[PDB]
Amino acid sequence: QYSPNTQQGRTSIVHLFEWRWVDIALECERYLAPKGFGGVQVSPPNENVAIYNPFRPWWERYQPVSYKLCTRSGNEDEFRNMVTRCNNVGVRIYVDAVINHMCGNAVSAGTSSTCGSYFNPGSRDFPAVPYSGWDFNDGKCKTGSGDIENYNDATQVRDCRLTGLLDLALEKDYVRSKIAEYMNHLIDIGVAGFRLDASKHMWPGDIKAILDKLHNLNSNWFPAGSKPFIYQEVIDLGGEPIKSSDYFGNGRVTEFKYGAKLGTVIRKWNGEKMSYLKNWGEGWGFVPSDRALVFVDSHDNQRGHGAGGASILTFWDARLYKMAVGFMLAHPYGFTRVMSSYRWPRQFQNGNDVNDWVGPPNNNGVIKEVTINPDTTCGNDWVCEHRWRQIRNMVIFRNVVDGQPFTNWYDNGSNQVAFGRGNRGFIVFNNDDWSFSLTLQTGLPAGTYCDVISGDKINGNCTGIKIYVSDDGKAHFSISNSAEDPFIAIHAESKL
Numbered sequence: 001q002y003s004p005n006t007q008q009g010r011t012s013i014v015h016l017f018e019w020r021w022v023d024i025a026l027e028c029e030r031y032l033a034p035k036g037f038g039g040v041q042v043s044p045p046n047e048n049v050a051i052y053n054p055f056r057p058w059w060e061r062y063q064p065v066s067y068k069l070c071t072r073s074g075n076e077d078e079f080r081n082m083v084t085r086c087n088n089v090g091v092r093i094y095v096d097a098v099i100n101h102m103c104g105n106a107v108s109a110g111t112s113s114t115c116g117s118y119f120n121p122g123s124r125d126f127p128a129v130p131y132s133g134w135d136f137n138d139g140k141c142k143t144g145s146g147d148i149e150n151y152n153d154a155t156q157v158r159d160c161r162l163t164g165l166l167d168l169a170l171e172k173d174y175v176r177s178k179i180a181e182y183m184n185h186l187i188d189i190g191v192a193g194f195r196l197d198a199s200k201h202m203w204p205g206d207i208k209a210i211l212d213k214l215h216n217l218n219s220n221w222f223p224a225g226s227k228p229f230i231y232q233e234v235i236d237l238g239g240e241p242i243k244s245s246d247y248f249g250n251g252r253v254t255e256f257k258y259g260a261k262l263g264t265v266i267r268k269w270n271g272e273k274m275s276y277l278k279n280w281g282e283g284w285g286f287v288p289s290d291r292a293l294v295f296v297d298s299h300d301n302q303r304g305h306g307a308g309g310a311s312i313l314t315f316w317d318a319r320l321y322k323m324a325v326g327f328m329l330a331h332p333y334g335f336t337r338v339m340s341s342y343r344w345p346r347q348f349q350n351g352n353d354v355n356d357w358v359g360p361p362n363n364n365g366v367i368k369e370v371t372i373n374p375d376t377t378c379g380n381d382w383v384c385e386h387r388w389r390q391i392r393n394m395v396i397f398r399n400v401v402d403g404q405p406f407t408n409w410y411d412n413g414s415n416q417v418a419f420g421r422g423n424r425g426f427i428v429f430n431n432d433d434w435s436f437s438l439t440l441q442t443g444l445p446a447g448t449y450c451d452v453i454s455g456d457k458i459n460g461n462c463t464g465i466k467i468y469v470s471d472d473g474k475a476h477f478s479i480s481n482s483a484e485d486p487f488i489a490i491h492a493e494s495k496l
């Protein structure tokens with residue numbers, strides 16, 4: 001459950017949010033594999049409801065109609081093709097599994113689905129699976145409205161409808177089997193693991209029963225006995241009766257306190273400063289590192305649309321965002337998930353963005369292809385943060401220092417900190433309103449290193465900042481608070 005099943009030396013996965021299968025297949029071969037990325041989290045590959053009001057929102061993909069591999073991302077052939085090609089280049093595929101529910105109970109019956117499948121929410125009829133009224137929790141939920149009304153009641157959180165979404169009776173073997181049939185079809189296709197959507201809304205025991213029905217990974221690509229990597233999406237912040245620790249027996253869990261706290265520290269909200277990150281990790285009350293899936297922002301919270309609210313840093317806050325991602329990728333805690341988004345027309349009103357529902361770039365509902373510009377950036381409104389030099393190079397930094405201990409910490413009691421990873425890497429940050437100019441102990445062997453944030457090592461030369469480490473492991477760093485990117489990172493592989 002707990003191992004990502006990535007190729008040795010690859011330590012991160014990237015969420016290619018709403019990307020088409022054909023574009024992901026290409027990205028695996030032309031960029032992801034060459035650049036050392038471990039895998040890709042894909043959007044739900046099963047048929048969902050086609051919502052036209054609002055026009056094809058991103059969240060319509062979280063309202064299942066059947067388990068047919070047919071969505072705006074592509075069909076089953078394109079899906080298998082993507083998995084095969086990515087696997088052949090050493091890049092894993094992790095599926096977003098929406099198994100807690102089907103579509104909204106108030107959705108009109110008909111064939112308004114991504115594959116034409118007929119469904120009738122009102123009568124609990126999903127013939128394409130098939131599911132009927134006996135497969136939902138309508139009779140089990142005890143709330144007056146049938147929806148989740150109070151999160152202080154761990155029971156209704158699990159048995160009632162999350163904002164109207166028809167709740168599956170996951171204790172029934174039939175339901176468990178239809179879910180497992182779907183997941184085993186994907187495992188046999190070649191996927192390496194799953195992101196279990198809305199895990200807080202399912203009983204830990206029901207999840208386990210389903211996982212026990214799962215096959216071992218495809219023996220054509222994975223060694224015998226490989227189990228799918230499982231990470232459960234559980235938003236567990238302040239005290240609530242549900243704890244993410246209740247799910248440790250099934251696999252990893254998303255640590256949403258991670259991005260929320262990193263965001264407030266870097267934004268310097270209410271007294272927090274980077275010097276406090278000295279004991280970042282369990283020391284901050286986070287789950288154990290070997291059970292954590294971490295990230296700065298996620299598709300569901302980068303819109304103020306989730307846990308962390310306004311503290312969350314996203315591509316919109318580019319300068320601070322790159323620094324947060326850099327800190328995460330450099331720090332040893334957890335398994336890292338990198339976000340890759342698309343631009344939407346944010347339109348704030350009374351503190352809230354009214355266009356937080358806007359789906360991916362499209363032409364009359366047809367998702368636009370990801371076009372690569374000559375400078376390696378993307379067109380068609382895809383942000384492609386995973387291609388930003390600062391993020392991509394830190395993804396590599398993590399691979400390079402993998403296994404190395406957290407050492408040589410330094411801080412000025414405010415917002416200028418630094419630390420290294422064994423004798424393989426070192427990173428320095430300046431988030432104060434004044435310049436940083438100091439000689440630090442890096443723990444790195446003597447030599448000239450290319451700063452990978454401002455540039456790259458291009459065959460015996462650096463295109464950006466160059467750092468000189470003396471025989472005793474010291475090196476001078478200068479970062480003005482006016483720098484484009486207020487941080488420097490050097491590692492074993494950027495050494496001249």
Ligand SMILES: *[C@@H]1O[C@H](CO)[C@@H](O)[C@H](O)[C@H]1NC(C)=O
Pocket residue numbers: 459460461
């Ligand atoms: C490094 O760049 C300089 C020119 O700036 C050039 O003289 C030298 O040959 C380069 N070294 C390599 C190995 O390309």
Ligand SMILES: [Ca+2]
Pocket residue numbers: 100157158159160167168201202
């Ligand atoms: Ca439920």
